[PDB]
Write a protein that binds this ligand. Structure first.
Ligand SMILES: Cc1cc2nc3c(=O)[nH]c(=O)nc-3n(C[C@H](O)[C@H](O)[C@H](O)COP(=O)(O)OP(=O)(O)OC[C@H]3O[C@@H](n4cnc5c(N)ncnc54)[C@H](O)[C@@H]3O)c2cc1C
Ligand SMILES: O=c1nc2n(C[C@H](O)[C@H](O)[C@H](O)CO)c3cc(O)ccc3cc-2c(=O)[nH]1
Ligand SMILES: [Mg+2]
Length: 474
DNA sequence: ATCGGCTTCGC
DNA sequence: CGAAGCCGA
């Protein structure tokens, strides 16, 4: 007799959704809900491309709920107060949602659940964004993994859950019920501008559930077979481009796994099978970092290891500015930074290259780079972004190798014809690939393009010195 | 507990 | 071919 509310946050789809399917099993009067949260939307680390993608996903989710039989309610404000209020005025029997791993989200959920319980309303929180929940993957000693290799061995051996059913034949709220909650609702989904953002840089995959599923299918039917080694070349469209869809849950993780598994089963070569397996390992890397953040929330605050907590970063603002403005004088680095600010996305090889460059060559606190990435990435995700940056600065629980990438080596290896470089640095197409890769461009040929802001070999030595020196004095 | 193994590499 | 010490079975 009472409606059940499903609260969407980062699972913007109707298909293969654990919490949603569970709620549907309890009632056909399943009403979706999304709460535009100022604490998230107005954070210093928000990207316009990310909000644009989100907004697009919400537009489709509203449509999907309408076709299913009910609707997606939209609220704006603090969910701790709005969600319980909505559930009460609606006399909802329960509120379902999928758990997250981020500190803010988990804290928020604790408050909402508590408020609901006090109101006598059931709050059900299920795991959905991961193939295996955090407490499901532990070492022999029953503790979380800090090393990927072992985590993967465990993770890959675990039986894989299959996609759940999409809810259908829903029952909408009555006109009276809508009247009772009207005061708490937004009449319409605000435009991107109304949310305080502007974006026309495009996306790696169009927003929404439909486009995410389409990309998954297309990727698994062709390109996935060549993932290894095509994944290493930024000039090639060798990766899935699904990152924002996985971040916001426009696609279910079980459906993604199923599609990759299917391609593997129908593969006719060891090369193809290897490529597909490598892509599956990337999905495991995603879970590794999410699990890590869940088990060790302090990771979000910075270096876990005492050594890196004391590292004497040079922090020359002029160098950071040059990095953010793609004016480093290092073509491969500048091209990557241009792709990021202009399109809200960066190939993984380049994310490693520019992160290494910022921390090792410019010797700037990686946390500055972490923030800048969150300010531009359409797929900006605390767990994965913090994981990537700490990896680049090698700041884990124990001493790890100094991963000092050589920009020229990287470019020669992964962009041998400077195709990617020329694509994002069109002003340098007249320069020979050889010089774009080495970074040695004659003054008259750079036509305004900056000379290298630092010397790699020299900076490499200066960084190692700082390191060893501290490793000694500590 | 000994010991294989440690995403992404430079030289 | 040493990675930085040490996780994980
Ligand atoms: C410094 C740095 C910052 C990063 N920031 C983010 C971020 O904010 N959000 C994010 O999702 N990824 C981040 N990455 C990881 C990786 O670069 C991106 O997931 C990838 O570029 C997404 O593109 P894709 O969809 O084509 O990838 P694919 O190669 O198609 O991989 C499929 C999916 O696997 C996951 N995945 C792949 N590689 C990784 C990885 N290394 N870590 C975690 N998940 C991975 C993603 O969800 C991705 O969509 C970062 C990496 C580094 C080195
Ligand atoms: O519930 C919400 N979740 C939003 N999310 C999803 C969240 O990450 C989610 O609430 C997490 O659980 C927070 O820890 C966003 C994610 C982004 O990357 C960018 C913007 C948003 C905005 C919201 C929002 O307004 N409301
Ligand atoms: Mg230790």
């Amino acid at each position: 007799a009472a409606p059940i509310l499903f609260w969407h946050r980062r699972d913007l789809r109707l298909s293969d959704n654990i919490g949603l399917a569970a709620a549907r099993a309890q009632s056909a009067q399943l009403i979706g809900l999304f709460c535009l949260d100022p604490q998230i939307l107005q954070s210093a680390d928000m990207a316009p491309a990310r909000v644009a993608y989100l907004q697009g996903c919400l537009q489709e989710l509203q449509q999907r709920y309408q076709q299913a039989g009910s609707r997606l309610l939209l609220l704006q404000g603090d969910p701790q107060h709005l969600i319980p209020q909505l559930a009460q005025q609606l006399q909802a029997e329960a509120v379902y949602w999928n758990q997250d791993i981020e500190p803010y989200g988990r804290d928020r959920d604790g408050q909402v659940a508590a408020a609901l319980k006090t109101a006598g309303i059931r709050a059900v929180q299920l795991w959905d964004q991961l193939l295996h929940s955090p407490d499901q993957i532990l070492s022999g000693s029953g503790n979380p993994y800090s090393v990927y290799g072992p985590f993967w061995k465990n993770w890959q051996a675990q039986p894989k859950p299959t996609p759940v059913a999409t809810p259908t034949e829903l029952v909408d709220l009555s006109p009276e019920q809508l009247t009772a909650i009207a005061p708490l609702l937004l009449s319409e989904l605000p435009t991107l501008k109304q949310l305080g953002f502007d974006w026309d840089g495009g996306f790696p995959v169009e927003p929404g559930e439909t486009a995410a599923i389409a990309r998954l299918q297309e990727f698994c039917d062709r390109a996935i077979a060549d993932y290894d080694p095509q994944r290493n070349f930024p000039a090639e469209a060798g990766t899935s481009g699904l990152s924002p869809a996985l971040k916001f849950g426009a696609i279910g993780i079980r459906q993604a796994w199923q599609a990759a598994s299917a391609a593997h089963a129908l593969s006719r070569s060891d090369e193809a099978r290897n490529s597909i397996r490598v892509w599956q390992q990337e999905l495991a890397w995603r879970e590794f970092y999410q699990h890590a953040l869940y088990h060790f929330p302090s990771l979000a605050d910075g270096p876990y290891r005492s050594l890196w907590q004391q590292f004497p970063w040079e922090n020359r603002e002029a160098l950071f500015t040059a990095w953010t403005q793609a004016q480093t004088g290092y073509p491969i680095v500048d091209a990557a930074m241009r792709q990021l600010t202009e399109t809200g996305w960066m190939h993984n090889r380049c994310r490693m290259i520019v992160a290494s460059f910022l921390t090792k060559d410019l010797i700037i606190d990686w946390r500055r780079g972490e923030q800048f990435f969150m300010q531009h990435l359409v797929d900006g995700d605390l767990a994965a972004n913090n994981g990537g940056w700490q990896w680049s600065a090698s700041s884990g629980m124990d001493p790890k190798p100094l991963r000092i990438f050589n920009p020229a080596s990287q470019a020669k290896k992964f962009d041998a014809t400077a195709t990617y470089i020329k694509r994002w640095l069109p002003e340098l197409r007249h320069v020979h690939p050889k010089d774009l890769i080495s970074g040695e461009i004659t003054p008259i040929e750079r036509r305004g393009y900056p000379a290298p802001i630092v010397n790699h070999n020299l900076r490499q030595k200066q960084f190692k010195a700082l390191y060893n020196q501290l490793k000694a004095a500590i």
